Design a protein around this nucleic acid. Sequence first.
DNA 1: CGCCTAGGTTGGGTAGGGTGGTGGCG
Lengths: 33, 259
Amino acid sequence: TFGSGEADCGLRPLFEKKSLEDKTERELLESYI
Amino acid sequence: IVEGSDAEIGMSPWQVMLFRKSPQELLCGASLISDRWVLTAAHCLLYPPWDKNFTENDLLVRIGKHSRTRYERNIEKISMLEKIYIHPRYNWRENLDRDIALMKLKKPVAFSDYIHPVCLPDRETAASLLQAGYKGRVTGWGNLKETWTANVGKGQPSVLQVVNLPIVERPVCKDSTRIRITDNMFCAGYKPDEGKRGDACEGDSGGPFVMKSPFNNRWYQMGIVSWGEGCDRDGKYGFYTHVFRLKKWIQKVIDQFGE
DNA sequence: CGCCTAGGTTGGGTAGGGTGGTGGCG
Ligand SMILES: *[C@@H]1O[C@H](CO)[C@@H](O[C@@H]2O[C@H](CO)[C@@H](O[C@@H]3O[C@H](CO[C@H]4O[C@H](CO)[C@@H](O)[C@H](O)[C@@H]4O[C@@H]4O[C@H](CO)[C@@H](O[C@@H]5O[C@H](CO[C@]6(C(=O)O)C[C@H](O)[C@@H](NC(C)=O)[C@H]([C@H](O)[C@H](O)CO)O6)[C@H](O)[C@H](O)[C@H]5O)[C@H](O)[C@H]4NC(C)=O)[C@@H](O)[C@H](O[C@H]4O[C@H](CO)[C@@H](O)[C@H](O)[C@@H]4O)[C@@H]3O)[C@H](O)[C@H]2NC(C)=O)[C@H](O)[C@H]1NC(C)=O
Ligand SMILES: *C[C@@](*)(O)[C@H](CCCNC(N)=[NH2+])NC(=O)[C@@H]1CCCN1C(=O)[C@H](N)Cc1ccccc1
Ligand SMILES: [K+]
Ligand code: NA
């Protein structure tokens, strides 16, 4: 069985959850353009 | 990680460290996908040509870390393994095809600001994000250089490293090496003409190659550090286990039992 | 008190820190 965590997966407590961007994710996002 | 940089605290809360009990040594990277499942590369646990073949009791896994060697009191969390599941068609004889493994913890871990799971991709996530030119992120406490030959600089970082790299066109990957490539693999890194640098290296295997969905803002693990030829060499690209191509096996194992 | 660098399942970054309690020196 999977267990706990699926619903909230991929959202970091110290970033997405506090609406803060790590120093380099921007580079990632921009690569999709 | 070659030509990467220090990670920020809690930047990769799904990062896991595969650690050998005795002697105490860091073996590989891994990733947290739930409170009781961890994903890593198969060769980290089983590689006959090098006499490698660990079992559940030989290892322990360490979650929430940043520093490679310090024991991070009140922050990190250590868990023993209940079971290890190597993909049954993991090809260690030739090219590491299906270089993937699932490890079940004995006791479910509690999440925290430093411990949180990454999402596994589905068909849409893969179609939309796994495209040549898009960038993903690799993390690990692996080597800062090819340590098997004389080179300047430290061998290991003191802190978790991170590097962003673009996915590369499959034909390029294929022509970059003489080792047989499969659809269960993808390669990533900069081309010589792009003038930028970065790659995973020995000790990084099992670590995740994650991508952020611009659509739902979540982090998805698309690959697993599997292999390479040298580290950060021009015309070479790091190879990663294709997670979504192996999703059926993964879910088959994770959902198998009601425990 | 203000500095200095330190065990421990552990460095020195500093005696908090992304964590708990804990020196020795002038
Ligand atoms: C890397 O290193 C590893 C680590 O060492 C190494 O592992 C070795 O691999 C060898 C293969 O070459 C293998 O050999 C075997 O050993 C047999 C005896 O060992 C088994 O029993 C002893 C003690 O009795 C244990 O100490 C061993 O761990 C081993 O246990 C067996 O393990 C297998 C695989 O995990 C189990 O299969 C799984 O079973 C699951 C279901 O489990 C139950 C169940 O129904 O719930 C549990 C029940 O207890 C059991 N019931 C009973 C009554 O026992 C049932 C029941 O067995 C079945 O249901 C009925 O079939 O199973 C799932 O089904 C799952 O899918 C399945 O994979 C297995 O259950 C378990 N058995 C028991 C009883 O617990 C030898 O007998 C065997 O002999 C064979 O070859 C001989 C010819 O040379 C021939 O004489 C003989 O008749 C056989 O054909 C052979 O020597 C080693 O056992 C194994 N060592 C260890 C320590 O694991 C890797 O190989 C190595 N890898 C590489 C690539 O290098
Ligand atoms: C186990 C992992 O730490 C490691 C990751 C290497 C990543 N390298 C780069 N440049 N991104 N994997 C390995 O060391 C694997 C396992 C066995 C040998 N190996 C290699 O990558 C060899 N250098 C090449 C290779 C040999 C045999 C089969 C596949 C690849
Ligand atoms: K301390
Ligand atoms: Na390269």
